[PDB]
Amino acid sequence: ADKELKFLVVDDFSTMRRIVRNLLKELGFNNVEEAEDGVDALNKLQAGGFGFIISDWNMPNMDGLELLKTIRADSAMSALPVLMVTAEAKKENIIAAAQAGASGYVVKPFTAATLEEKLNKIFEKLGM
């Protein structure tokens, strides 16, 4: 998929944000912005431009699940790719995230190799 694509990395922890950010750089994706919760995320999303969301699951204010749901209910943002990040591959989550239209799923901690999979998977499902 196109390299100039604009990412939004959403996580309450800045280290996780910086990890994901650098992993994306490694795979040749340099256009990344950050947010610390769902509300922060939504606020930046409404500036337009973004083509992919990587979101943490557990966040005060508005967790990733609520965020994803808001994106899907949003007329302009409904189709946006959203990869959900979680600390546990709990069956219930994977379902929850599926129900809500999560494009993909990943457990932290995760390697660059692992991220390349998930992104590519997403890209081939949607035609990016």
Partner: peptide, 8 residues
């Protein structure tokens, strides 16, 4: 079994 079926 779940992850796969879902395209995850």
């Amino acid at each position: 079994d779940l992850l796969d079926s879902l395209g995850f």
